Paper text:
In order to obtain structural insights into [name], we crystallised the full-length protein comprising the amino acids (aa) 1-570 (Lem3FL) and a shortened construct (aa 21-486, Lem321-486). A superimposition of the Lem321-486 crystal and the AF2-predicted structure revealed high similarity (0.88 Å RMSD (root-mean-square deviation) on 444 superimposed Cα-atoms). Many PPM like-shaped proteins possess such C-terminal bundles, including SidD. A hydrophobic loop within the C-terminal helical bundle of SidD was shown to be responsible for membrane-localisation at the Golgi apparatus. Since SidD also targets Rab1 during the infection we speculate that the C-terminal part of [name] might have a similar function and is responsible for [name]-localization close to its target protein. However, a corresponding hydrophobic loop could not be identified in [name].
[name], the causative agent of Legionnaires disease, secretes the enzyme AnkX that uses cytidine diphosphate-choline to post-translationally modify the human small G-Protein Rab1 with a phosphocholine moiety at Ser76.
Residue numbers in the entry: 19 to 147, 164 to 233, 242 to 364, 375 to 486, 494 to 526, 544 to 565
The structure:
């Protein structure tokens, strides 16, 4: 059914910062982002924080692409999935055919990785036999090893692996290649063909993948820096506190998680672009030419002496974002012509529970009841396992429209209440059940003393239980349980 989801080529009307300064975070997010939901345990938010300072981008192409393919075992039960997300390198310079060409490789790279069936190291080797960075991973369940997740990240992509309590466990950092004086560009998947130097998960774990427009807005952390390689990530203390509004709430949807992170990233993005226009307006108000001031260190002499000491530190923080003498006309014209932001995209993937997927397929495909019946004898160990499983399935929320605006995100339950309550009681009774003809009578005794509503699913149970001519005598006494069903009023 909904086992493969890929984002589409979006084009938005991006206003300027001078018009976005009079808007709150709700107005900025609803005009620039979309939501692509796959289930309660996977969702994607894609948009564009790209904007200009005094003009509007009427055809702002979103050059990012995220995808997901959920894989199943031999019996049709989910046992893994493959996720990939790409960031279009460059583009947005005004050439639309260039933007289409960059998105063409960005979308095809994500789609070709998903449609492959090999491991992550062989899949990449085949497809790398117009640039776009990429970040992908593949998790899958092994018999004695459980979930095994192989990762892969190239460029400005970032991966963060949490557990069920939003506690950080691993991070796959981004990269930058020094190609010149201040020319740090992230490596690309297409560079893998140009160079030979290419340089155990658990249930409920949260794998979050984000683009340069997402984690670049949060508090950063330069992990490593060589002579031409820069490993960068986010401050794990600041990224943890983003989950403080989700500590006690049980089982949140991957959309709600991705919504929290994106809201915080766009909150700092909207404030950083406001601080930049407040700084430029405050510099133009001084008219430094009347006092003949051009050196950046003499401008700091002016601001610190005048009383705008916090306007100076604001300017110093941007100088570090990008002493010696540098003129004013260079930095002002540079800041005026800068583009703020990037295409922002994020995908959150929760590792499922084995029992939750065994029950999910048991509900979706009921004809497989006797096939996967002995599997319940293995997973189910206590009625706390089933109650925990169905409690998680109760709070699951899906999105009817796969792709919809982020403000008009309508969700509803992924299971009907009567479908969950009855299926829980069936599996609960099957566990409470699981020596010749004597036990053949005792099975009819426990079923007789029981008085469960909609007990017609005994035939559904008997299939799981069946897996001289005394079988006939018991099923005869089971047609006596039909009298017990007739007694039910
Ligand atoms: Mg980007």
């Amino acid at each position: 059914m909904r086992d493969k989801i890929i984002t589409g080529k979006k084009i938005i009307f991006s206003q300027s910062v001078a018009k976005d300064q009079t808007k709150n975070l709700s107005s900025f997010l609803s005009e620039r982002f979309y939501s692509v939901n796959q289930s309660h345990n996977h969702s994607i938010i894609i948009g564009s924080s790209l904007s200009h300072q005094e003009n509007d981008i009427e055809h702002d192409t979103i050059l990012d692409t995220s995808g997901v393919l959920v894989t199943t075992d031999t019996n049709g039960i989910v046992n893994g999935a493959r996720v990939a997300i790409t960031d279009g390198l460059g583009g947005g310079n005004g050439d639309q055919e260039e933007d289409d060409e960059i998105y063409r490789v960005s979308h095809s790279s994500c789609e070709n990785f998903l449609n492959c069936d090999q491991n992550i190291d062989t899949t990449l080797s085949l497809i790398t036999q117009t640039e776009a960075s990429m970040a992908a991973f593949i998790y899958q369940n092994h018999p004695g090893k459980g979930y095994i997740g192989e990762f892969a990240n190239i460029g400005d992509g970032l991966i963060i692996i949490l557990d069920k309590r939003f506690k950080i466990k691993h991070m796959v950092s981004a990269c930058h290649i020094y190609r010149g004086f201040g020319t740090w560009t992230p490596p690309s998947l297409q560079a893998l063909a140009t160079t030979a130097n290419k340089d155990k998960l658990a249930e409920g774990d949260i794998i979050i993948s984000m683009t340069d427009g997402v984690w670049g807005e949060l508090k950063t952390s330069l992990i490593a820096q060589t002579n031409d390689r820069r490993d960068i990530g986010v401050d794990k203390e600041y990224f943890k506190t983003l989950f403080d509004e989700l500590t006690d709430a049980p089982y949140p949807s991957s959309f709600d998680i991705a919504r929290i992170i994106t809201q915080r990233a766009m909150s700092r993005s909207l404030e950083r672009r406001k601080t930049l226009i407040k700084l430029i307006n405050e510099i133009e108000q001084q008219h430094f030419h009347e006092k003949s001031v051009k050196t950046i260190n003499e401008v700091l002499e002016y601001f610190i002496k005048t009383g705008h000491v916090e306007t100076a530190q604001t300017l110093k923080a941007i100088l570090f974002e990008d002493n010696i003498e540098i003129p004013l006309e260079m930095v002002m014209h540079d800041l005026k012509s800068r583009t703020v932001g990037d295409c922002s995209t994020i995908n959150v993937t929760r590792i499922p529970y084995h029992l939750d997927e065994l029950i999910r397929g048991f509900i979706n495909y009921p004809e497989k009841h006797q096939i996967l019946a002995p599997l319940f004898k293995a997973r189910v160990k206590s009625e706390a396992d089933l109650e925990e499983a169905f409690h998680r399935l109760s709070l699951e929320m899906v999105q009817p429209e796969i792709e919809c605006p982020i403000s008009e995100t309508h969700f509803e339950r992924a299971f009907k209440k009567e479908t969950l309550d009855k299926t829980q009681a069936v599996l609960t009774h099957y566990f409470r059940i699981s020596n010749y003809q004597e036990r053949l009578n005792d099975l009819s005794a426990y079923l007789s003393k029981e008085s469960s509503l909609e007990k017609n699913d005994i035939k559904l149970l008997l299939s799981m239980l069946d897996s001289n001519k005394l079988y006939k005598a018991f099923h005869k006494k089971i047609e006596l349980q039909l009298l017990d069903s007739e007694i039910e009023n």
